Amino acid sequence: LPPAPRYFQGENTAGFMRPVRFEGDITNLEVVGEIPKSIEGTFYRVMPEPHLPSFIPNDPWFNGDGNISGFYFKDGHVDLKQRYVRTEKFVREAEARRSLLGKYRNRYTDLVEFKIRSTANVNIVYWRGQLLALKEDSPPYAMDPETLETFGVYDFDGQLPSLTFTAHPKFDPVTREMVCFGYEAKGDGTRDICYYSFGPDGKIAETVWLVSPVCGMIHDFAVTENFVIFPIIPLVCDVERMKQGGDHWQWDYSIPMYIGVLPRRGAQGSDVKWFEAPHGFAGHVANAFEDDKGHIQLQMAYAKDNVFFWWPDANGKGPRPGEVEAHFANFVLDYQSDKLPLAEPTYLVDDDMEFPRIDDRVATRKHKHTFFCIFDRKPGVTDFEFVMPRAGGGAPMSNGLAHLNHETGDIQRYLPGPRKLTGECIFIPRNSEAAEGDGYVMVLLANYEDMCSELAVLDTKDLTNEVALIKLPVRLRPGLHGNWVDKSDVDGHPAPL
Amino acid sequence: LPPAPRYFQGENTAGFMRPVRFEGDITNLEVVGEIPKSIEGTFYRVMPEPHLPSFIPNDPWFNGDGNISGFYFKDGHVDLKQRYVRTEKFVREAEARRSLLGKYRNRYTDLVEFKIRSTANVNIVYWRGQLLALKEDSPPYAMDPETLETFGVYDFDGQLPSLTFTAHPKFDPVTREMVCFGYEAKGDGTRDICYYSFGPDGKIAETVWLVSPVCGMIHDFAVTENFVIFPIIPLVCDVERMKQGGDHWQWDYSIPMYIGVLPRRGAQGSDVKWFEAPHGFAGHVANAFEDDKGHIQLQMAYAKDNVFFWWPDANGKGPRPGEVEAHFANFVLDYQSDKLPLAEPTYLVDDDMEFPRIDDRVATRKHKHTFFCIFDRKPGVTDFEFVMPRAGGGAPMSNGLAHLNHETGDIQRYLPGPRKLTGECIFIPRNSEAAEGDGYVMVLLANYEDMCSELAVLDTKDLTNEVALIKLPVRLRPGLHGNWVDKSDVDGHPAPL
Ligand SMILES: [Cl-]
Ligand SMILES: [Cl-]
Ligand SMILES: [Fe+2]
Ligand SMILES: [Fe+2]
């Protein structure tokens, strides 16, 4: 077999990116300032964190074993519980004490045959008393919200119709449905999209099979009262390339950014309309809604080039690190229109941004608040001379949060400081009676000065000021998505506005 | 109640001394070099590590909750398990989410009444299939060697005759007895010493009550074939001072360093002879043995002033930090002599030293190898300009290990580097046929450059060279004592030579 390294090497595991790989508990975290005593619930987040050194040199960040953090809040006290998802990969590599899974989404490079290749490392959501650890090439892994025990690969009582489950399901705050899909839904390189939903009782509702015009990456999607929307990243899969040891994904400069629109209820596959947006990168969806005219307003991060630059086109053509900016775009779609080409979107702010969150009490409906990561290159905001040598590589950089009020157009910016970077934030309603976007924001900080992580608590009344700074004595590696589960919500999801 | 701080403050919890307070697992630790594949067993060590900020300002290092590390070795792979001892203090403070136990060994400063005040933070030994977590003011806490679960306070099947159990019991490699004592054995300020032993079947053998000439600290003791030896540190307890909120311990410049000698088997309390060594500090015992003439050779660290300078005399007189050196002393004692005063000891090396270990296969018998911590002020050995600002306070410093061959007088020195310090080492016999002092030495390093801990593996053939350096991504706070439990030893202790 290819030799197993016994320590981490390369930029993707250097400095703040060095795996810690700890599982367990740190109770009664140190707090500077004061955590509001009324906050009760759990912040769950997932990070890719390789458990064993890869036999693949410069293995991408996206290929690391999913490690779940829970921050349990009550009466102004907070405890950390941390545990790896027991994926097939994790368990078999732990048994062998060496890496066995090969390149990102390329089973032809694996040293043994895997049934499930999930690292379960992208999102961690709450559904019917379980956590679901998500990776878009796989079904979810079900976990205990209290102990972070892994129950195992989850098939929704045998109802899961798809080999794949999106990392970005939407929770309808009115119907209490989980709205889902999977792409490559019949295996590697398939153009099959399976759109499916679960009612609050756990019974499957929608199941529609449709066909993508290309085998393109559909990372995120949008849900409105009457439509589901599938934006396709112009990364394209060729299985014959994979069989020769090549990348699952390859940029295609020659195709539009396709945006599929399907009726949400009772549709057949042929009802999808593949609208054609100007060529670009489909970032994360903030939210979508139908306006008075019945037009879909799709608000999402949008770049004009390949954000995933490490997967360039067939001729190795693509941007360099830190070159590509994504902007907060609004696309207008009319399902009734027979005109497939779409106009350039309007932009809601100027900031280089990503990781948009809304008040999920208005998810699938008109929202007027968005919280998002920003990356400001303006001199002094980040001390790059100090941070870059300590940062390692492979992960996106955010040096603040912004709150956009969509009605007033007012923007507040949180800057943690010149030697700190942020992850994706969560929003917490102040209480069950709170107005949209009124309450608390939490975000994990990388402190390059201490080489420690911190959890910031902000009040939406003034996003510039930390109400509390929770000081971890370890690093939590830069991660991906996370969610708030409020103690006052019996089903784990907030009540509609 | 006195207010509970919500973050650590003061020098004793700054820099490398900042509590981490993690419990759980890090498997498959990163290794530079190669762990010898034949090493099979577990290195257990204990550190004081406050679980909650103290309401006592500048609480000494010795007062922190005991946290147990196990390093489990097999086939050149190593896993860390880490867990706090569930002392009465730990459990009640965890339930309250605040500190309740007050000053070191002063129950009159506690915010609630404790039955047991142990932090179980000084030593961690193996006895008849359990770990015993030791603190000289208390009985042991019994723990599971595999899971580090705490069973609870241990009374040896109801046989424990003493309120107190030394942190330095001796294991007779021939008789397989655990030889023990406790001082202040009938409560705070009592001069009662209880000498007691357990046979390998767990049955109590010796129990002798004797009387100390002063209520002095007896931290360590020595055992030979026919004698047990009690060196008294001139720190003295006055319970009336403690009732007013004063220190348990106060230096007395006016007394000798008493060295009690008692027949090991069948003695009465009145058989003890209190020899009087020149005034000084009784450090850790390397080992004691009877020579041809039946004279006790007692080899131990010995200083001429108060090493525990934070507990000065009645007028606040004593040394400053880093002023007092301890030296590797040999005392000669003849139980038959009626002459109480003892000559100044001979010194085996010139190094400022402590934490002596021998090959425990010759414990209580003639030894010819000692491994010990050294602190070398020779310019360049430690980069003090870099280290001191990052070190915090309250813990002793060691910047190397030395191996003394007692026959040849040859000394090898291990220097981890100018920005690293060491803990107490362990010795591992190469195999059951190995000569005395032949095998492996392990020692935990504090790396002030990375602010991480490392576990060094040395071969006794050349102590100057690391065979392996195990790289922890977290800090293990400077700790106290530790022990090797070899897989090849059914009772957890090595076979006699
Ligand atoms: Cl599990
Ligand atoms: Cl326990
Ligand atoms: Fe995502
Ligand atoms: Fe000791």
UniProtKB/Swiss-Prot annotation, chains A, B:
Binding site for trans-resveratrol: Y104, K135, E354
Cofactor(s) needed: Fe(2+)
Cofactor binding note: Binds 1 Fe(2+) ion per subunit.
InterPro entries documented for this protein: Carotenoid_Oase
Chain positions recorded as Fe cation binding sites: H168, H219, H284, H481
Top-level taxon of origin: Eukaryota
GO biological process: carotene catabolic process
Enzyme class: oxidoreductase
Signal sequence segment: none
EC number: 1.13.11.-
GO-annotated molecular function: carotenoid dioxygenase activity; metal ion binding
Inducers of expression: Expression is induced ba resveratrol but is not dependent on light.
Keyword Oxidoreductase attributed: yes
Metal-binding as UniProt keyword: yes
Residues reported in the UniProt entry to bind piceatannol: Y104, K135, E354
Purpose of the protein: Dioxygenase that cleaves the interphenyl C-alpha-C-beta double bond of resveratrol to yield 3,5-dihydroxybenzaldehyde and 4-hydroxybenzaldehyde. Also cleaves piceatannol, a compound that differs from resveratrol only in the occurrence of an additional hydroxyl group, which leads to the production of 3,4-dihydroxybenzaldehyde and 3,5-hydroxybenzaldehyde. Is not able to cleave trans-stilbene, 4-monohydroxy-trans-stilbene, 3,5-dihydroxy-trans-stilbene (pinosylvin), trismethoxy-resveratrol, and 3,3',5-trihydroxy-4'-methoxystilbene-3-O-beta-D-glucoside. Is not involved in carotenoid metabolism.
Protein name: Carotenoid cleavage oxygenase 1
Organism in which the protein naturally occurs: Neurospora crassa (strain ATCC 24698 / 74-OR23-1A / CBS 708.71 / DSM 1257 / FGSC 987)
